[PDB]
Amino acid sequence: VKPLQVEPPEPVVAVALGASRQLTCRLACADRGASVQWRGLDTSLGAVQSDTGRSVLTVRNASLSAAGTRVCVGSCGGRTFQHTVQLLVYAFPNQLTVSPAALVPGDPEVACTAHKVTPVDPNALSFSLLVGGQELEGAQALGPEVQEEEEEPQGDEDVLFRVTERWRLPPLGTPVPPALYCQATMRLPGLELSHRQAIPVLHSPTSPE
Numbered sequence: 758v759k760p761l762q763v764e765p766p767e768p769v770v771a772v773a774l775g776a777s778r779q780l781t782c783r784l785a786c787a788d789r790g791a792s793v794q795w796r797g798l799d800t801s802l803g804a805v806q807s808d809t810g811r812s813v814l815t816v817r818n819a820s821l822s823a824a825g826t827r828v829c830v831g832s833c834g835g836r837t838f839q840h841t842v843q844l845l846v847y848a849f850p851n852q853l854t855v856s857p858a859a860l861v862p863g864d865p866e867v868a869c870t871a872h873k874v875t876p877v878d879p880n881a882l883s884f885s886l887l888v889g890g891q892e893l894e895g896a897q898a899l900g901p902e903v904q905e906e907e908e909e910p911q912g913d914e915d916v917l918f919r920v921t922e923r924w925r926l927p928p929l930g931t932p933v934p935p936a937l938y939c940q941a942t943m944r945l946p947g948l949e950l951s952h953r954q955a956i957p958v959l960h961s962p963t964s965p966e
């Protein structure tokens with residue numbers, strides 16, 4: 758026995774903004790008084806149904822308000838059990854922007870900004886400058902977080918973040934690569950999302966042999 762179970766078990770459960778997830782808390786009770794309760798604050802765009810798997814917590818079209826700790830407490834026979842789970846709501850960037858859009862082997866730097874993101878802290882969001890399938894050696898860094906304000910007519914509502922990462926560029930090299938790549942990776946409990954965005958390297962350094 759347990760005798761209180763939650764499906765899924767994971768202590769941390771990640772859900773994409775606007776998606777859905779349902780947690781089923783079950784209690785094996787030999788007695789009459791058996792009672793199950795879901796708490797924390799409640800919300801998410803979630804609900805609670807009982808008697809068809811004890812009590813299921815369903816988060817629908819998740820919002821950032823969904824995130825937070827949820828607790829299922831089950832009472833049975835003057836005895837009480839629990840299971841605590843953290844809902845982690847996140848938003849992977851829907852666009853990646855590279856400045857300059859293309860790289861004449863000139864030289865300066867390059868910036869890559871991810872749009873509409875959460876979370877934005879390292880350990881959960883990293884950027885990479887790639888040449889082929891490996892990170893460009895000699896590239897530096899510095900990443901700024903920004904908040905975005907929007908809500909244009911006849912549909913929806915809300916606010917997220919725009920993170921940019923800049924890189925002072927090394928010489929590059931011979932033979933100049935056809936393109937460099939910016940990659941934004943998000944690593945959450947159980948998952949890893951990634952976005953690779955091409956940045957064309959202009960085959961211009963001419964003039965010699």
Ligand SMILES: *[C@H]1O[C@H](CO)[C@@H](O)[C@H](O)[C@H]1NC(C)=O
Pocket residue numbers: 775802818913914915
């Ligand atoms: C919940 O909110 C999201 C974004 O604000 C929206 O796309 C979705 O349709 C909403 N769900 C409902 C039932 O309104």
